[PDB]
């Protein structure tokens, strides 16, 4: 499992 | 004196990065002139983030949904693109703070100062070292995709890295600002891991030069060994093989400290077999390899950057 | 997901440092607002370096004798001053890039990200820890004095240090921007060996907490040790004694990782007695003691700065 | 023999 980075940002 | 992870100053790179938002997936992207570089997986949502198809995903996306934030000032998008692994969003304005830059792909072993940034703002800096398996032991958390691993030579920044992902083992991987990916990895959630790691010999030698210059001379010994014997003993000890051009690149250090390359090379090969024996070198009890000879000569002589 | 000596971004501090020149001697100087904070020994020459008379030396030097360069722009002094050991040269203009500065002192154990500058220009950054003997294991060369070791709380710069001299053992000494030395020092080239050094226990505990958080749990053990027993073990092992206040500091780390403070105090007690057993933690065979719990939380929770 | 850092700049 290769985690992939991103920001989980609302709205 | 002294010797630490002397990371490059980051003022010329802080002001040239923006946040990149599309849909609910957000990440930070580098901003140069009228172009905003961001990882291509910005478009992917967690629903379809495993084995995606970027060619049609970009087609579905438009100019309006690519919303980029230059910190507080709202930024307008007037274009889009997708080269090998990174988008190339264009913006109406041109960044005042863009420094002299050049995208440089660096061979394994070269070190650079990463500007770890979360939600489009600087968070910290430190020197990574691109291991032979094309992975950097970064310190990145969620929202870090796009933290450029810049590098400053003569006041011209040389963006040589752009973070994309981790690995199950715990290391990170990313593309150069050109877009061509670093190593064999792919940008999908597929089970994906790096090969065996190899300690970089030239960086160890540069670190030992720093040790000798900083008054640490206990590991030096009269013994001297030839290049090929050292290569084999390092091979049985998982070190990257030493070639003559490396001895060439250590030349300035050898001249400065007065110690021949092969002398400390035999010292190192004896150190590996005998072990560290307990007493430390510059506060490290392990053969630390993240200093290139350029970094050592930079830190032990003093180089201007302005 | 990794953990390295991650130092604060420096763009807010790079543009606030200038050259200060008094005759032959030139060195770094912080340029907050219209004041240029430079160390006392700018006036002092090599001839009168040992046991100087700063009170008379400053009187002997006039305003025009103080040559201050902001990179290429020439600065004109409109007056000077003298706090405890730092000068307060004023300039005609006011730095546009001055951030929200806040002069503070730091108790031994607090860490800050220095901005080692040579010839009035930023050169690099790293995290130093104010050791209990009031010295920092810096990486400074000749001409680096006045290179402030700053700190960023949330959005404001919080200058904590200002490099002045070097010690024969290799460590360095400096002042707050107020001017008072850290510990028992004098500003003269006289025998000034610092006292014995003690490993900072709370920082070691924070480092171990970071190690637990980043997937390393091998050193954790069932056995639990009370605080007083831990202190009586640690004093013979040179570690600084642990107090209830420190345990209160580690509260967020204990809550986040779920591990009780005393359990990992016992783990550190066992680790420190038998030894590292020859397998590293976070790529270190010796216990790191330069990570504050605030820094660990900052690096493992994505704190924002802008 | 405490060293005291400063720059050796001519003119």
From Swiss-Prot, chains B, C:
Cytoplasmic side: 1-306
Cross-link (Glycyl lysine isopeptide (Lys-Gly) (interchain with G-Cter in ubiquitin)): 5, 90
Protein activity control: Inhibited by pyridone-containing alpha-ketoamides compounds 13a and 13b. In turn, alpha-ketoamide 13b (tert-butyl (1-((S)-1-(((S)-4-(benzylamino)-3,4-dioxo-1-((S)-2-oxopyrrolidin-3-yl)butan-2-yl)amino)-3-cyclopropyl-1-oxopropan-2-yl)-2-oxo-1,2-dihydropyridin-3-yl)carbamate) inhibits SARS-CoV-2 replication in human lung cells. Inhibited ex vivo by michael acceptor inhibitor N3. Inhibited ex vivo by compound 11a and 11b.
Subcellular location, record wording: Host cytoplasm; Host Golgi apparatus; Host nucleus
Entry annotation: catalytic residues: 41, 145
Result of changing residue 205 to V: In strain: Zeta/P.2
Domain Peptidase C30: 1-306
Effect of residue 189 to A: Does not affect ability to cleave and inactivate human TRMT1
Reactions this protein catalyses: TSAVLQ-|-SGFRK-NH2 and SGVTFQ-|-GKFKK the two peptides corresponding to the two self-cleavage sites of the SARS 3C-like proteinase are the two most reactive peptide substrates. The enzyme exhibits a strong preference for substrates containing Gln at P1 position and Leu at P2 position
Phenotype when changing residue 132 to H: In strain: Omicron/BA.1, Omicron/BA.2, Omicron/BA.2.12.1, Omicron/BA.2.75, Omicron/BA.4, Omicron/BA.5, Omicron/BQ.1.1, Omicron/XBB.1.5, Omicron/EG.5.1
Free-text function comment from the UniProt entry: Cleaves the C-terminus of replicase polyprotein at 11 sites. Recognizes substrates containing the core sequence [ILMVF]-Q-|-[SGACN]. Cleaves and inactivates human TRMT1, preventing tRNA guanine(26)-dimethylation of tRNAs. May cleave human NLRP1 in lung epithelial cells, thereby activating the NLRP1 inflammasome pathway. May cleave human GSDMD, triggering alternative GSDME-mediated epithelial cell death upon activation of the NLRP1 inflammasome, which may enhance the release interleukins 1B, 6, 16 and 18. Also able to bind an ADP-ribose-1''-phosphate (ADRP).
Quaternary structure, from the entry: 3CL-PRO exists as monomer and homodimer. Only the homodimer shows catalytic activity. Interacts with host FBXO22; this interaction promotes the proteasomal degradation of nsp5.
Identification of the protein by name: 3C-like proteinase nsp5
Organism: Severe acute respiratory syndrome coronavirus 2
Gene name for this UniProt entry: rep
């Amino acid at each position: 499992s290769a985690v992939l980075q991103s920001g989980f940002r609302k709205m």
